[PDB]
């Protein structure tokens, strides 16, 4: 059938902590419009968001627009992906990565 959320969703101060609290599995993509590697992986994240629709919520946290939230996790390079299980960070991926590696990363934590 069709899922409620099947694509990446914008996160900011109005829904970041709430999304983590109310969804068992969340992947947050920390990104910025000036980051070339971020743009390079965006299509892969979209595809995985469709593939794991209903299982994993893919959030996008713009680091320019939400510096405090990014600083909370010590984001020192982008793109950084963090896997949140039950609202807690349990794994991370830093820098652009192939889809195959990205998917295995999800499967390892989901």
Residue numbers in the entry: 25 to 134
Q: What sentences appear in the manuscript?
A:
Thioredoxins and thioredoxin-like proteins (glutaredoxins and protein disulfide isomerases) are prevalent in nature and found throughout all kingdoms of life. These disulfide/dithiol oxidoreductases function via their surface-exposed, redox-active disulfide bond. The cellular functions of these proteins vary, ranging from electron transfer in response to oxidative stress to folding and refolding of proteins, while their varied functions are linked to the range of redox potentials spanned by the disulfide bond, nearly 300 mV. In this paper we systematically test both hypotheses with a series of thioredoxins from Archaeoglobus fulgidus (Af) and Thermoplasma acidophilum (Ta), which have been shown previously to possess disulfide bond redox potentials spanning -32 mV to -287 mV at pH 6.
As the names imply, the mutant AfTrx3HP has the active site sequence CHPC; AfTrx3PH has the sequence CPHC, and AfTrx3KP has the sequence CKPC. The AfTrx3HP mutant crystallized better than wild-type and thus was used to provide a structural depiction of this archaeal protein. AfTrx3HP shares the classic Trx fold, consisting of a central core of five β-strands enclosed by four α-helices. Indeed the disulfide is in a hydrophobic environment, blocked from direct contact with solvent by residues Trp 58, Pro 61, Ile 102, Pro 103.
